[PDB]
PDB file of C-alpha atoms and ligand atoms in Angstrom:
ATOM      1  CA  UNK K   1      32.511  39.487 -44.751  1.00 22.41           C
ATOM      2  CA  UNK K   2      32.715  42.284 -42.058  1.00 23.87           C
ATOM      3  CA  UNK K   3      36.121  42.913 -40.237  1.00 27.84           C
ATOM      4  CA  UNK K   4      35.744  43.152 -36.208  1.00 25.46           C
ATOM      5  CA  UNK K   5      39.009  45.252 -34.156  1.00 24.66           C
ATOM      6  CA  UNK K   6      36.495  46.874 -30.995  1.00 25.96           C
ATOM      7  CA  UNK K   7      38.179  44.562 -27.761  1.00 23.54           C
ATOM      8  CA  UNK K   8      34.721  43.868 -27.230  1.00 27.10           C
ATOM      9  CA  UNK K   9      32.944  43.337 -30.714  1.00 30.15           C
ATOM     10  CA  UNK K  10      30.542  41.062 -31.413  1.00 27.29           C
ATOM     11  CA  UNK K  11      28.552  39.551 -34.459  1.00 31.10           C
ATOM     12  CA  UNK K  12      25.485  36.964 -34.374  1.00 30.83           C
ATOM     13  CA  UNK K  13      26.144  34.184 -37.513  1.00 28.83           C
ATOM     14  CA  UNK K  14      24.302  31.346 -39.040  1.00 28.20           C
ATOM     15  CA  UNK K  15      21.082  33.187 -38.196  1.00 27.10           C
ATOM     16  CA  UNK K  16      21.600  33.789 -34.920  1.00 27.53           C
ATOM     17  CA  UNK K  17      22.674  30.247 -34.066  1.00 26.97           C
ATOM     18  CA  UNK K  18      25.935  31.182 -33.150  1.00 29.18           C
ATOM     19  CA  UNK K  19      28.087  34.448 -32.068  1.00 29.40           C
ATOM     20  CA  UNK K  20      31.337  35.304 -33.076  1.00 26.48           C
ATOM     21  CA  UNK K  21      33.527  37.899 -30.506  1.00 25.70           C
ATOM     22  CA  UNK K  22      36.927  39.627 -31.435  1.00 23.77           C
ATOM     23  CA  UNK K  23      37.313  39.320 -27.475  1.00 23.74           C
ATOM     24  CA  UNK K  24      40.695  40.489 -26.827  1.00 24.67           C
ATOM     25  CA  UNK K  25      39.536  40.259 -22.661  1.00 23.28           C
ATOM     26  CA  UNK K  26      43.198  40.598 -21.324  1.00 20.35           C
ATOM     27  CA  UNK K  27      45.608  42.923 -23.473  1.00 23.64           C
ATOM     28  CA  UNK K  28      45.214  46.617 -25.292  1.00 20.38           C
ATOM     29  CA  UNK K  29      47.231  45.174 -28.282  1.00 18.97           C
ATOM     30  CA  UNK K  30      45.236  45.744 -31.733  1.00 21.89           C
ATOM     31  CA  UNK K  31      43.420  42.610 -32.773  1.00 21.37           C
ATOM     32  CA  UNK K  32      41.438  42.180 -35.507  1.00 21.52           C
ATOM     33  CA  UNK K  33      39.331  39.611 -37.277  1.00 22.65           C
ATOM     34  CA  UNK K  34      37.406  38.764 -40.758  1.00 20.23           C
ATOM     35  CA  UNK K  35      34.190  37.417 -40.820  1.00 20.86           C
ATOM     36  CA  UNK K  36      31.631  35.636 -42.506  1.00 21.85           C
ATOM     37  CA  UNK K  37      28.089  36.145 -41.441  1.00 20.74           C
ATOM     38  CA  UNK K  38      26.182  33.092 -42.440  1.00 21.31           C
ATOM     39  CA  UNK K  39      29.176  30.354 -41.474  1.00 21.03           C
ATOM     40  CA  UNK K  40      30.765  32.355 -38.551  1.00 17.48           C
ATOM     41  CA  UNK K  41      34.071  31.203 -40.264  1.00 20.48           C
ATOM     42  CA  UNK K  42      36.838  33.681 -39.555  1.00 25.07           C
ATOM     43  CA  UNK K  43      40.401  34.730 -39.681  1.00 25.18           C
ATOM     44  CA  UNK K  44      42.469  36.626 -37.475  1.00 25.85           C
ATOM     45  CA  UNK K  45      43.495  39.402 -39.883  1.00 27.81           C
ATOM     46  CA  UNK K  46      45.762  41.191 -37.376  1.00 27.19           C
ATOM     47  CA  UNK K  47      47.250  40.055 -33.823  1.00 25.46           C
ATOM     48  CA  UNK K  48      49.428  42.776 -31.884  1.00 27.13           C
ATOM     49  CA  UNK K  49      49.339  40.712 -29.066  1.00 26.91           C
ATOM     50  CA  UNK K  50      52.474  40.055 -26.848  1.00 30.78           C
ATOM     51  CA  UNK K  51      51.129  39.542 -23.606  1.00 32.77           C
ATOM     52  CA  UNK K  52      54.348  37.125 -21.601  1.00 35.77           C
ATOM     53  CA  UNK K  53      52.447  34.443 -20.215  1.00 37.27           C
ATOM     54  CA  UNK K  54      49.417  36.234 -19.831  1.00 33.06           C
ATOM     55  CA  UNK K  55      46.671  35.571 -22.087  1.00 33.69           C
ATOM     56  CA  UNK K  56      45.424  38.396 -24.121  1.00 34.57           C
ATOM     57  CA  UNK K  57      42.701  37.611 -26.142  1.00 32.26           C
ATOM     58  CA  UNK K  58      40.216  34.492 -27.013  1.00 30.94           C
ATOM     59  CA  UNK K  59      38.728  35.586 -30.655  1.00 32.13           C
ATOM     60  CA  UNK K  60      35.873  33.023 -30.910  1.00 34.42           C
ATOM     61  CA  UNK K  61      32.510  31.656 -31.970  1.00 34.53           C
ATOM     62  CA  UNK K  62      30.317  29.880 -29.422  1.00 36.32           C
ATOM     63  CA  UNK K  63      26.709  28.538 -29.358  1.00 39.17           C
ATOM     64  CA  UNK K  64      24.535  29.496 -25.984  1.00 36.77           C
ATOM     65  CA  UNK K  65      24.942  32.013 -23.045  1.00 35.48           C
ATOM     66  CA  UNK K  66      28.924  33.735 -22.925  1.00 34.65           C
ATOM     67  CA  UNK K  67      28.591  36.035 -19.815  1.00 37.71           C
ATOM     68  CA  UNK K  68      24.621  37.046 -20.257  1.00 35.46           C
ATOM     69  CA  UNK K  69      24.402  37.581 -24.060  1.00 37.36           C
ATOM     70  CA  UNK K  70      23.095  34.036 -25.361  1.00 37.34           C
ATOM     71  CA  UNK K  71      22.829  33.066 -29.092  1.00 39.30           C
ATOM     72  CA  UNK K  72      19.167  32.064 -30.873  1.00 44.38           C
ATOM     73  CA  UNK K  73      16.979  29.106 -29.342  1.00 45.21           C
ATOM     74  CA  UNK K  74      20.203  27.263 -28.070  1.00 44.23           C
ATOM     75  CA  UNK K  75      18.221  25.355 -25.514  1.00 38.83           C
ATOM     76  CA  UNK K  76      21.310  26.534 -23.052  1.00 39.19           C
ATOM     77  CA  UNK K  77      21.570  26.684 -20.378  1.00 41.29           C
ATOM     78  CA  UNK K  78      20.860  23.127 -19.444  1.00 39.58           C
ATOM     79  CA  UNK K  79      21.807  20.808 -16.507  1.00 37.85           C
ATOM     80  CA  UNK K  80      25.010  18.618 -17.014  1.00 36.77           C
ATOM     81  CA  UNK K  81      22.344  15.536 -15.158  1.00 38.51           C
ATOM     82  CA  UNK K  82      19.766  16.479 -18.198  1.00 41.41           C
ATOM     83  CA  UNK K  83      21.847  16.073 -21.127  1.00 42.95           C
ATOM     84  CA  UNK K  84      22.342  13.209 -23.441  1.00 45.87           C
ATOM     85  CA  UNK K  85      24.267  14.312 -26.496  1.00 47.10           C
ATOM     86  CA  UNK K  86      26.476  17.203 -26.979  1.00 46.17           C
ATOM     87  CA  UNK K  87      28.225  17.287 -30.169  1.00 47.85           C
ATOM     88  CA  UNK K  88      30.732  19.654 -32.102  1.00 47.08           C
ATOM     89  CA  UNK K  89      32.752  19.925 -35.710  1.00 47.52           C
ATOM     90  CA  UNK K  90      35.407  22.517 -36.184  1.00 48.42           C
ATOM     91  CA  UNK K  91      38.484  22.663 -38.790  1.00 43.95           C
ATOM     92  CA  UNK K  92      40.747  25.169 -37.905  1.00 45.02           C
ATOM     93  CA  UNK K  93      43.838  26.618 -40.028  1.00 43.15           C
ATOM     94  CA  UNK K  94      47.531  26.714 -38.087  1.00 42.11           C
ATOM     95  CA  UNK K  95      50.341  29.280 -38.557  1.00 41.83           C
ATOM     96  CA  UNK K  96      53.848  28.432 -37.746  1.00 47.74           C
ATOM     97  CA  UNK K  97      54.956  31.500 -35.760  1.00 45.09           C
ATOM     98  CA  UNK K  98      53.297  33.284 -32.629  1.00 47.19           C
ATOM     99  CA  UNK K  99      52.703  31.582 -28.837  1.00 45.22           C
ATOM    100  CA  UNK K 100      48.618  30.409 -28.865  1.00 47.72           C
ATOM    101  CA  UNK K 101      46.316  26.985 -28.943  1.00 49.61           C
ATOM    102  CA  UNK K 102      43.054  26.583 -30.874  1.00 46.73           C
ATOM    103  CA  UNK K 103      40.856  24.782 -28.489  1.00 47.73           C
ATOM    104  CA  UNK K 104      37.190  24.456 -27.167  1.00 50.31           C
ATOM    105  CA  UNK K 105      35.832  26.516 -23.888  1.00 49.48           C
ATOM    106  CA  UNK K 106      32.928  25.286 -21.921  1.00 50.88           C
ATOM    107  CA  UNK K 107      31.434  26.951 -19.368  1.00 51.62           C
ATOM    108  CA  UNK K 108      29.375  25.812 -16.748  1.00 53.30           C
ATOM    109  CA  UNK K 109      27.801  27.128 -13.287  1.00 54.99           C
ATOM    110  CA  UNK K 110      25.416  26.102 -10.526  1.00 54.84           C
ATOM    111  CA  UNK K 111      22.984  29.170 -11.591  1.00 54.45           C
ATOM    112  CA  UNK K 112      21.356  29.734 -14.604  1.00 53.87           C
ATOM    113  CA  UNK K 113      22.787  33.573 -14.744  1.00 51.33           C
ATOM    114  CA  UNK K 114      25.917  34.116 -16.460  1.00 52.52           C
ATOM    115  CA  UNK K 115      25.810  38.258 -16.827  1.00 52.00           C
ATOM    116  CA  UNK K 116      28.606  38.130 -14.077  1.00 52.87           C
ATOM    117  CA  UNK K 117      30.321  34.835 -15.201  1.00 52.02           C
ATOM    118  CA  UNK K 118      30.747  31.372 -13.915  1.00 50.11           C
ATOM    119  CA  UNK K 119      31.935  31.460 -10.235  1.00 51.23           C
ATOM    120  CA  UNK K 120      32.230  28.297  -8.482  1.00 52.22           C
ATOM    121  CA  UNK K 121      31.010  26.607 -12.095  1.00 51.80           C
ATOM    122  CA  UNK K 122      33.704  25.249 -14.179  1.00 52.31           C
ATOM    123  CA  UNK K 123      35.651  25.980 -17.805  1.00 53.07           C
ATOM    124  CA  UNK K 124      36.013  22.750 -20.085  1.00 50.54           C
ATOM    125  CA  UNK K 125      38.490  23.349 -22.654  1.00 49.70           C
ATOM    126  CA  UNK K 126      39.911  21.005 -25.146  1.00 53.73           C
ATOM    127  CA  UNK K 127      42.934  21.995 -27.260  1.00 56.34           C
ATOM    128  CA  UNK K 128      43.272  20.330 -30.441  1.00 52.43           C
ATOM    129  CA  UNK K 129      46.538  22.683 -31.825  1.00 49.12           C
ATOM    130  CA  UNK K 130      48.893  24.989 -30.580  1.00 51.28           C
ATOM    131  CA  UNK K 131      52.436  26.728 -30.964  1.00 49.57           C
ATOM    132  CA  UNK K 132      54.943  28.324 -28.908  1.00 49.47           C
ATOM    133  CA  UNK K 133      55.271  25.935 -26.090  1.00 48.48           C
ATOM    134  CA  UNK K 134      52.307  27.204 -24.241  1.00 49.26           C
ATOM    135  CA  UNK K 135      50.760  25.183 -21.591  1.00 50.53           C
ATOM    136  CA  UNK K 136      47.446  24.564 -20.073  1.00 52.91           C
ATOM    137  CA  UNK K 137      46.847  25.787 -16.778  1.00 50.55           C
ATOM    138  CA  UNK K 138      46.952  23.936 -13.432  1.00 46.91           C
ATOM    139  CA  UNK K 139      48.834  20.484 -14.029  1.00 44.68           C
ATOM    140  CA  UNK K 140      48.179  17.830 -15.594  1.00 45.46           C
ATOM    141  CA  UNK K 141      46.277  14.593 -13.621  1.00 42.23           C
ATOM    142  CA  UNK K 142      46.186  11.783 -15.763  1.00 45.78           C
ATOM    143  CA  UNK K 143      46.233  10.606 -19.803  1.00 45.49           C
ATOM    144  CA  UNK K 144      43.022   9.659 -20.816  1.00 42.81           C
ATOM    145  CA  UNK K 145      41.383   7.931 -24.127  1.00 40.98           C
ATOM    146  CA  UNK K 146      38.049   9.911 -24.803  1.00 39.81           C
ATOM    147  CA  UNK K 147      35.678  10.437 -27.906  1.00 41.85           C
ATOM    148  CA  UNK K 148      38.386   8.649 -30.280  1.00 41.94           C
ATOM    149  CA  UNK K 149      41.350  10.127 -28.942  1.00 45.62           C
ATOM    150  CA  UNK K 150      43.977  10.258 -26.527  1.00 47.57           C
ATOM    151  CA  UNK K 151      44.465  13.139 -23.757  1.00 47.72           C
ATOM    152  CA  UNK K 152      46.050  14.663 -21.245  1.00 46.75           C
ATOM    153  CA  UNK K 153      44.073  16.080 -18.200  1.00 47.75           C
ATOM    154  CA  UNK K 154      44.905  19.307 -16.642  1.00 45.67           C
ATOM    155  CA  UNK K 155      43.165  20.515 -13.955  1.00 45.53           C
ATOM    156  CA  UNK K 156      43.573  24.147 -11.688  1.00 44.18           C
ATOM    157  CA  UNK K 157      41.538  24.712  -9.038  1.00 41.50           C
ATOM    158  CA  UNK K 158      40.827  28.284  -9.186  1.00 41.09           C
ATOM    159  CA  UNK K 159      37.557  30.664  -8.838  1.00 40.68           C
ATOM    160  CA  UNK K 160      35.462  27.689 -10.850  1.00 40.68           C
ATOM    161  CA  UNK K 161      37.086  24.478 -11.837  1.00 41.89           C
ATOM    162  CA  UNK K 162      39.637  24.375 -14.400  1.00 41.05           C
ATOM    163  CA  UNK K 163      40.161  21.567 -16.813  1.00 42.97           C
ATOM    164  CA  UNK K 164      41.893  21.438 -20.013  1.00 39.29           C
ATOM    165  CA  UNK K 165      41.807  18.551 -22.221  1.00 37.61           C
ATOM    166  CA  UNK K 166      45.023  18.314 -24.443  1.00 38.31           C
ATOM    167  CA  UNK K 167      45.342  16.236 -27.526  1.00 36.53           C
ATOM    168  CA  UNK K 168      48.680  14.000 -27.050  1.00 36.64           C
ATOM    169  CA  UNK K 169      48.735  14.764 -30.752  1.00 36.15           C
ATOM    170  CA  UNK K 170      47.695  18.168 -32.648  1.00 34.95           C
ATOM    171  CA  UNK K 171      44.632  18.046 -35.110  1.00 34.18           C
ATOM    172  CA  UNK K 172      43.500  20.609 -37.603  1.00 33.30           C
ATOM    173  CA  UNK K 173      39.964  19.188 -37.163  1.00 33.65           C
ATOM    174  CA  UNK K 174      36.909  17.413 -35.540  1.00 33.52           C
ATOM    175  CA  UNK K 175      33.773  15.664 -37.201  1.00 32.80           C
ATOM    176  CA  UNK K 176      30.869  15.469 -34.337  1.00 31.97           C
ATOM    177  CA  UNK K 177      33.297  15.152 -31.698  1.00 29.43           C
ATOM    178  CA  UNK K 178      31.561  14.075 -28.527  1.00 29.84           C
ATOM    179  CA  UNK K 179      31.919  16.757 -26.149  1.00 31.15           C
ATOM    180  CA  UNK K 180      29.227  14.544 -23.630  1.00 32.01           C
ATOM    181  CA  UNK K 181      32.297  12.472 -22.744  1.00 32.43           C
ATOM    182  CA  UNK K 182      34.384  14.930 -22.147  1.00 32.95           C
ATOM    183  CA  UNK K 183      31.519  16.378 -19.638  1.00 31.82           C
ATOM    184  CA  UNK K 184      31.167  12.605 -18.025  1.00 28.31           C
ATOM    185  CA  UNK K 185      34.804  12.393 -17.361  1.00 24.97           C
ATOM    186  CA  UNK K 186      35.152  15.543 -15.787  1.00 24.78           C
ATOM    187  CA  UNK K 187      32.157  14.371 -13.632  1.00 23.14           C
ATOM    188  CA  UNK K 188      33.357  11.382 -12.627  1.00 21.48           C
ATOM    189  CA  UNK K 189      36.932  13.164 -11.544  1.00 22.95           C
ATOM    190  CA  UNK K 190      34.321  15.315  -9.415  1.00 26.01           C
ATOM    191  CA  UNK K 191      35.422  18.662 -10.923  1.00 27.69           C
ATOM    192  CA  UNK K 192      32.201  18.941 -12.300  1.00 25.49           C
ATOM    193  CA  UNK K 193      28.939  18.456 -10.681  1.00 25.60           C
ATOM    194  CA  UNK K 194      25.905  16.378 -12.268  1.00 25.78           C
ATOM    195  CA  UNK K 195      23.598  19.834 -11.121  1.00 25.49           C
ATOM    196  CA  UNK K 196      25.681  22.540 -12.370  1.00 21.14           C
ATOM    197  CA  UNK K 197      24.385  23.985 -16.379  1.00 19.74           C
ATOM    198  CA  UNK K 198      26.124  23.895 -19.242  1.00 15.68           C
ATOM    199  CA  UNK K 199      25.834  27.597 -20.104  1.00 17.80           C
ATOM    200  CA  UNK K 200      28.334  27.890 -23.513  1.00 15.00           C
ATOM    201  CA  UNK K 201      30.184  25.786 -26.127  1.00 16.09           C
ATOM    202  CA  UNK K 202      32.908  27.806 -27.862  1.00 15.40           C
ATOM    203  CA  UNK K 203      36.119  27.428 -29.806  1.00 14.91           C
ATOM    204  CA  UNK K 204      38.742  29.462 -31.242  1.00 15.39           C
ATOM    205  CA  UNK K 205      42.274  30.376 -30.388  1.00 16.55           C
ATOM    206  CA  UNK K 206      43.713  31.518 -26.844  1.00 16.91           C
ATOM    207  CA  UNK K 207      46.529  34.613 -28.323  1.00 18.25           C
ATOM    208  CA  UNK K 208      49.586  35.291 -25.827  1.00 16.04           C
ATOM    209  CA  UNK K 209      51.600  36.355 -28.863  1.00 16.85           C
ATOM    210  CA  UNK K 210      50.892  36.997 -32.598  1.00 16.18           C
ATOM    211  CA  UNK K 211      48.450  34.800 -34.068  1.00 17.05           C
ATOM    212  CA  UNK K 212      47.570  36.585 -37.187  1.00 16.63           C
ATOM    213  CA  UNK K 213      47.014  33.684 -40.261  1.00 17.69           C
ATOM    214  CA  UNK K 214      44.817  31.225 -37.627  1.00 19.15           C
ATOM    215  CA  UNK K 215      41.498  30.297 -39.025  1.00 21.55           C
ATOM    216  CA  UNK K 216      38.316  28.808 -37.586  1.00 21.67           C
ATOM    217  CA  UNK K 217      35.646  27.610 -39.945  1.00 22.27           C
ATOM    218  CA  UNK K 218      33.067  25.103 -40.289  1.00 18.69           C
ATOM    219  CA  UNK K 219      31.454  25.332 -36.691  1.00 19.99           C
ATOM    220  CA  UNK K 220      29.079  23.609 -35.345  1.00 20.00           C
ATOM    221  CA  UNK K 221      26.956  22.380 -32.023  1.00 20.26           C
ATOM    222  CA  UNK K 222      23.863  20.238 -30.870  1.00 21.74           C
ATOM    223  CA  UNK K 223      23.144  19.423 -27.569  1.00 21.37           C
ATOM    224  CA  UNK K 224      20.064  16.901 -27.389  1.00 21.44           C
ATOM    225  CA  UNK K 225      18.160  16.733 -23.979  1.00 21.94           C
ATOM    226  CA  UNK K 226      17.394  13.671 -21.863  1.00 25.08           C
TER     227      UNK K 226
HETATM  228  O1  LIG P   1      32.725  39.934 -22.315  1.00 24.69           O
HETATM  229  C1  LIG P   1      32.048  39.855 -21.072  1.00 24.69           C
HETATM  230  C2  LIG P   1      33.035  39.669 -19.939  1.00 24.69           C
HETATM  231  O2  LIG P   1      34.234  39.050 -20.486  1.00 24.69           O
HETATM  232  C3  LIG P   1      35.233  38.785 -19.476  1.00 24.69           C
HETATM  233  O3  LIG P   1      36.362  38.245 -20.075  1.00 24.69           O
HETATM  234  C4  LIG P   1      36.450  36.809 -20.054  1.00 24.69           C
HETATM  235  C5  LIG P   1      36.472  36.298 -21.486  1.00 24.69           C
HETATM  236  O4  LIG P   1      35.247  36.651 -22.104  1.00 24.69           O
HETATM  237  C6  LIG P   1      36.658  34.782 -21.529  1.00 24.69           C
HETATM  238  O5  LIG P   1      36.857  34.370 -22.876  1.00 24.69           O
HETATM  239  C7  LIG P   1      37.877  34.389 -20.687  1.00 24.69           C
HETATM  240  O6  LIG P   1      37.993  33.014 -20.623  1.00 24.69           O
HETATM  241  C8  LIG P   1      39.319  32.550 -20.314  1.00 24.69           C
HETATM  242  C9  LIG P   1      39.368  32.017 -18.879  1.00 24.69           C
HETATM  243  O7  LIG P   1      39.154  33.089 -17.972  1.00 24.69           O
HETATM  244  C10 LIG P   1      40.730  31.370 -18.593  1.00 24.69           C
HETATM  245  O8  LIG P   1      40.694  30.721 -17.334  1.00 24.69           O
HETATM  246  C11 LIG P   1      41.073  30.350 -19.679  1.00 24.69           C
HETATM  247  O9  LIG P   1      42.346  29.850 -19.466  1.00 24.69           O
HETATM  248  O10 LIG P   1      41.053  30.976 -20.966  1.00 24.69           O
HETATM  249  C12 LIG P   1      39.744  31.473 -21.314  1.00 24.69           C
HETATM  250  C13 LIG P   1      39.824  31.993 -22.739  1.00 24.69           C
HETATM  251  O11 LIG P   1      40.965  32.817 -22.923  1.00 24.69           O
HETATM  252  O12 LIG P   1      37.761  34.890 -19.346  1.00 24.69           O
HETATM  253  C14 LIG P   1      37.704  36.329 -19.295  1.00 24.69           C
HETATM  254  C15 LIG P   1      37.733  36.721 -17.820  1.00 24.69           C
HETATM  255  O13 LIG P   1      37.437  35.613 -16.977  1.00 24.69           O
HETATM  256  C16 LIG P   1      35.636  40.064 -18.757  1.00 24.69           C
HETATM  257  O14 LIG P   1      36.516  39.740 -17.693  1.00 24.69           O
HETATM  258  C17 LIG P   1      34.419  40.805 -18.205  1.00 24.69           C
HETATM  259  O15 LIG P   1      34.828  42.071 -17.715  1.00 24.69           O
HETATM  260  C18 LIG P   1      33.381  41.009 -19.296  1.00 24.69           C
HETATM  261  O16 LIG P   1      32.213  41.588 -18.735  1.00 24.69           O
END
């Protein structure tokens, strides 16, 4: 495996399939993480982090286009309107200490150009585990029962449409999850428009505080066209 600390470093996995970042995007704490090239699987192997309620860092592995720098042949981006399957499996490891969530980010925009983000798009996320009483953002809008499980909605309407998906019940894993119903909800609550792409699937753990011991392994993602 090859250990990543840069704030910014990078590695492509699974032959280019997928693209794992350290991405500590919002603190100058130390953060460090272990991975393996051909599964993308990876631990956080060190977590300075203690950013208050300010999020310092998303370590993660995602499949398409994260601001400009897009993984191999992921067919992404694609319109929301053009899409007929979008599918996922993650298992990820907990820790008992440290203020963070393990959970899915989606992005999506009207333009096909991400090199300066997703502005007036929106950011799908789906947490599936979590410690240290963190929150989503926004509030939450309703309680609803999607892809084999129950969730609550949270929705913020900032810069690009905000909603977070959060299990009523924590899970260390998902089997082909069906992200395409998360997508059609969010469509039919109108925070996410039928023209707008789906630019980038990724997972892995939002760090406030700590989060050294959290694991993500087994990743995966298809997206099928109409
Ligand atoms: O690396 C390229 C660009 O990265 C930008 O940082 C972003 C992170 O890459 C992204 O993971 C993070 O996503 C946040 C989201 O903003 C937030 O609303 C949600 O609650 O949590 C997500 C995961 O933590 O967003 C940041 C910034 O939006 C840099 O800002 C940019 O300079 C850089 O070119």
């Amino acid at each position: 495996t090859v250990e990543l600390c840069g704030r910014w470093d990078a590695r492509d996995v699974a032959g280019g399939r997928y693209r794992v970042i350290n991405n500590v995007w919002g603190a100058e704490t130390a953060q460090c993480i272990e991975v393996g090239l051909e599964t993308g699987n990876f631990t956080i192997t060190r977590a300075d982090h203690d950013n208050g309620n300010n999020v310092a860092a998303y370590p993660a592995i995602y499949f398409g286009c994260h601001w400009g720098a897009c993984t191999s042949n992921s067919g992404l981006p694609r319109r929301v309107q053009e899409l007929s399957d979008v599918r996922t499996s993650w298992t990820l490891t907990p820790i008992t200490t440290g203020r963070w969530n393990a959970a899915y980010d989606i992005w999506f925009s009207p333009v096909t150009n991400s090199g300066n983000g997703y502005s007036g798009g929106a950011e799908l996320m789906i947490w599936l585990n979590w410690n240290g009483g963190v929150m989503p953002g926004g509030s939450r809008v309703a309680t609803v029962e999607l892809a084999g499980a129950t969730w609550e909605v949270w929705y913020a309407d900032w810069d690009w449409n905000y909603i977070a998906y959060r299990r009523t019940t924590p899970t260390t894993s998902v089997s082909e999850l069906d992200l395409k119903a998360f997508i059609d909800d969010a469509v039919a609550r109108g925070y996410i428009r039928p023209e707008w792409y789906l630019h980038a699937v990724e997972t892995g753990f939002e760090l406030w505080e700590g989060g050294a011991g959290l694991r993500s392994a087994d990743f995966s993602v298809t997206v099928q066209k109409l």
